[PDB]
Amino acid sequence: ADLKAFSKHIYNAYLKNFNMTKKKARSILTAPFVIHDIETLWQAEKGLVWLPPYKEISVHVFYRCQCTTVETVRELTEFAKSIPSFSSLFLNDQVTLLKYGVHEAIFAMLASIVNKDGLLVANGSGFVTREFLRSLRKPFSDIIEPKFEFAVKFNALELDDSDLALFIAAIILCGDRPGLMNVPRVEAIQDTILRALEFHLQANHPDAQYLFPKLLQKMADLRQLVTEHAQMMQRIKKTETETSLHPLLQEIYKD
């Protein structure tokens, strides 16, 4: 009943806080400058499309990834704060939820800007090919591929921005997070969001392909995806000594 209005407030918060909507993304994807080799990557840097001291091609890509990720974390923070029930939480719990939730949300939203062939970069000014990213030296290519596999299956669910606003909110407001102080309040908020989501999916996808429980599965898939990604990020930290890691991302991964 009150859930329809509750979803509108979340959707509003999403529209207010993210630079790239799926609506914007899909329209661009169907012109952005194409990065498919070293030459085009260099031409993208020469101002036409767009940091620590230069090392190499794969590390340059890794550095630009961090920049993007840091910026997405900022947006997710503002999104979450635009939800009143999130803002009533003590700041430590807010930080705990963002700590353990941002990468799950990042990979979910990433599907919005991805097709079988590649992904948009630089606020839609660029399109980097999947084949080009495959060509980067290990471990970077290994880290990248699973996100394509995830994003393609996820895009088959044909969610829109209003669906995603609730889905991301549910990811952030998660009672399972380690070190959470007020577990009961968060669980109660999660439950309201999930109820709003099921209600919203009924109204928005009337002939739903068992859509709500498939999204719950995707949430579990995202948790596994982040687990594996964190393991791969630990490998970078251990093996790539000369490569710098953004302080905030270091804080997120810590413990």
144 binds, among ligand 3EQ, ligand JZR, none (CB under 5 to 8 A by kind): ligand 3EQ
**Alpha-carbon distance 20 to 153, whole Å?**
20
| Selection from 191, 158, 7, 187 nearest residue 83 by Cα | 7
Binding to ligand 3EQ by residue 200, rule CB under 6 A? no
Q: Does 105 bind ligand 3EQ (CB under 6 A)?
A: no
**Longest CA–CA separation in the chain, Å:** 56
Q: How far apart are CA 128 and CA 34, in angstroms?
A: 6
CA torsion sign for 38, 108, 103, 23 is positive
How many of the chain's residues bind ligand 3EQ (CB under 6 A)?
23
Please identify, using beta-carbon distances, which residue of 188 and 236 lies nearer to ligand 3EQ: 236
The option from ligand JZR, ligand 3EQ, none interacting with 234 (CB < 5 to 8 A, set by class) reads ligand JZR
Q: Which of 11, 18, 62, 154 is close enough to bind ligand 3EQ by CB under 6 A?
A: 62
Q: Scanning residues 43 to 102, which ones bind ligand JZR (CB under 6 A)?
A: 66, 73, 77, 95, 98-99
| Bridge-based pairing state of the strands 33-35 and 126-129 | parallel
245 binds ligand JZR (CB under 6 A): yes
C-beta of 25 vs 196, nearer to ligand 3EQ: 25
Cβ 122 vs Cβ 50: under 8 Å: yes
Question: Distance between alpha carbon 240 and the CA centroid of its chain, in Å?
Answer: 24
Give the interface with ligand JZR as residue ranges (CB under 6 A). Answer: 66, 73, 77, 95, 98-99, 230-231, 233-234, 237, 245-246, 249-255
